[PDB]
Design a protein around this ligand. Structure first.
Ligand SMILES: O=C(c1c(F)cccc1F)N1CCCCCC1
Length: 460
């Protein structure tokens, strides 16, 4: 029975509005409704992994697991295994997988982050799950961010707190936040970003939605505009939105958007908005293709419609050779040539690098670089040909070319990371000097760049 090199992943996000679901929710898991929908010919084909994020979820874990499992069994005739379930207040994540995957999944982690302080602490935040699927690390984040059209900056702050403090994946990757710990990271939820148009334009917006003309609305979506301005979700992807705004509906129909200010809304307008979103970030040159992104039309218990997204995702096998794991394979090596970091910092400490990768027995510390002044004010840290030769555990190119090197640039004075990035070993050539590049981030914000050349030796 061969190990897969692709799997499909279903991501769902639904703010349930504190109401129990209707008796049938299969359209959600089938990616049927509005937007980029799944072909009918695939309806019986199970996804490998289903990740369900809910917000304002009024059900117990037991109650929701029974609904989800019975739903998938009705669709696929497969009894899914529960990988993980984690709940913070009324924010929940469930991960289900095909039974054939049970012995491919390991290192299961869960965590949550509570956002805000005092007033603003008590219902918003995030839950997450991570695990290994054979040689591939997968992370999943369900966040319910701050509500309200005039709180986009708070949402951005909530995002930075979640990626800083959510403790998922390999704790040995100590310089790295969740935006670097996984081969594939999916971040979804009621992100609560709104269409920023005047309140007076409510009926005009509704008209546009009825005509399926979303362009003049999406050009004012706060998540797209904040992302364009590099204020949030830097280096994440989102599929194009081709479904109607998923909030705020009158319950028990989808024929009406309920946007007017009411005591129940704190006298706030809720113009139709794409609150409910799925984004992802995968390591460079790993296969990931969105195959659906849309909303259901027939699930109407909440003032939000459920959102679905599905992905093809590249996975690798748990590789064994005669040598590694448990030793190096002297036929393998990674050399960095003519490397330099460009940093936005005003600091004047010396810096060193750390190289982290599951192709190494443990992380590798470099010597300190040579600081120079850049022509436009910047710090340039030069490593020359000084960087340590990295010794991978396995030299087979079928393994090594699929790996990645995480890089942290750390202050010698404080040992704190000033920037993190990732280099793919999926090179055009081996035994050949080739350009490499990564942006560097810290707390998910841009702090610099790392560039130079690489020379990879495999056993072939
Ligand atoms: O499509 C992108 C995009 C891009 F154009 C280049 C690189 C990475 C990206 F994610 N974004 C969505 C539209 C708004 C702009 C922000 C990001």
């Amino acid at each position: 029975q061969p190990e897969p090199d692709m799997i499909t992943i279903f991501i769902g996000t639904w703010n349930m509005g504190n109401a129990p679901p209707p008796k049938k929710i299969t359209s959600w898991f089938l990616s049927k409704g509005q937007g980029k929908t799944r072909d009918d010919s695939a309806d019986y084909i199970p996804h490998d992994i289903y990740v369900i994020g809910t917000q304002e979820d009024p059900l117990s874990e037991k109650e929701w697991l029974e609904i989800l499992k019975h739903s998938l069994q009705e669709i696929t005739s497969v009894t899914f295994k529960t990988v993980a379930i984690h709940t913070l207040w009324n924010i929940r994540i469930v991960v289900l997988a095909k039974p054939e995957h049970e012995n491919r999944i390991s290192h299961i982690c869960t965590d949550n982050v509570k956002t805000g302080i005092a007033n603003t602490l008590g219902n918003k935040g995030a839950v997450g799950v991570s695990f290994m699927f054979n040689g591939t690390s997968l992370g999943f984040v369900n966040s319910h961010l701050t509500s309200g059209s005039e709180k986009k900056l708070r949402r951005n702050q909530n995002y930075m707190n979640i990626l800083r403090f959510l403790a998922l994946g390999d704790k040995k990757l100590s310089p790295f936040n969740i935006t670097h710990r996984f081969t594939h990271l999916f971040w979804f939820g009621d992100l609560n970003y709104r269409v920023d148009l005047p309140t007076w334009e409510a009926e005009t917006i509704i008209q546009k939605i009825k005509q399926q003309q979303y362009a003049d609305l999406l050009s004012h979506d706060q998540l797209l505009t904040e992302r364009r301005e590099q204020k949030v979700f830097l280096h994440f992807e989102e599929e194009e939105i081709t479904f109607a705004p998923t909030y705020r509906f009158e319950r028990l129909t989808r024929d009406k958007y309920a946007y007017t200010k009411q005591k129940a809304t704190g006298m706030k307008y809720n113009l139709p908005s794409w609150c409910d979103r799925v984004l992802w970030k995968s390591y460079p040159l790993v296969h990931v293709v969105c195959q659906s992104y849309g909303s259901t039309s027939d699930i109407m218990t909440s003032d939000h419609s459920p959102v679905f997204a599905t992905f093809e995702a590249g996975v690798t096998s748990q590789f064994v050779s005669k040598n590694g794991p448990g030793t190096v394979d002297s036929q393998g090596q990674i050399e960095f040539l003519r490397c330099y970091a460009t940093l936005k910092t005003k600091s004047q400490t010396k810096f060193y690098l750390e190289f982290h990768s599951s192709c190494l027995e443990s992380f590798v510390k470099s010597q300190e670089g040579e600081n120079e002044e850049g022509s436009e004010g910047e710090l340039v840290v030069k490593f020359g040909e000084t960087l340590p030769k990295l010794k991978p555990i396995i030299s087979d190119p079928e393994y090594l070319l699929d790996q990645h090197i995480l890089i942290s640039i750390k202050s010698s004075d404080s040992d704190e990371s000033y920037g993190e990035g990732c280099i793919a070993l999926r090179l055009e050539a081996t035994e050949t000097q080739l350009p490499i590049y990564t942006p560097l981030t810290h707390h998910g914000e841009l702090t610099g760049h790392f560039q130079g050349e690489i020379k990879l030796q495999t056993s072939q």
